[PDB]
């Protein structure tokens, strides 16, 4: 599999885990461990994605430079969702660190159920992203 997808995989499977909750997760996201390691799979998977991209671009089929320029544009906006999503996720998981030490203790349980329906949106997101993404890719 690609390398982009793999490392997006990695990515993909550490927040597929963060949406368990389970306990180690919890006590991870209250330093701020996950969120550090999510970057870093996030960095990684957009670093191998810009050199794909470069790599593909050695080996196209030429067309209209109206056409071209698009395709590239399109592909540059397509990459950029991705990247904002992987941050959108970091993004929530810092939130829910402050609401816990805004809590002073008390039961985060209710916290908990919502942190985990809206991840569950923001990785649909995440994946429906990935998707076109590959898509438009291999048109490339």
Request: aromatic share 6%; hydrophobic share 40%.
């Amino acid at each position: 599999g690609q390398r982009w997808e793999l490392a997006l995989g990695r990515f993909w499977d550490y927040l597929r885990w963060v949406q368990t909750l389970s306990e180690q997760v919890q006590e991870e996201l209250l330093s701020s461990q996950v969120t550090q390691e999510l970057r870093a799979l996030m960095d990684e998977t957009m670093k191998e994605l810009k050199a794909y991209k470069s790599e593909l671009e050695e080996q196209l089929t030429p067309v209209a430079e109206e056409t071209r320029a698009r395709l590239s544009k399109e592909l540059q906006a397509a990459q950029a969702r991705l990247g904002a999503d992987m941050e959108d996720v970091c993004g929530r998981l810092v939130q829910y660190r402050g609401e816990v030490q805004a809590m002073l203790g008390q039961s985060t349980e209710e916290l908990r159920v919502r942190l985990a329906s809206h991840l569950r949106k923001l990785r649909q997101r995440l994946l429906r992203d990935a998707d076109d993404l590959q898509k438009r890719l291999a048109v490339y």
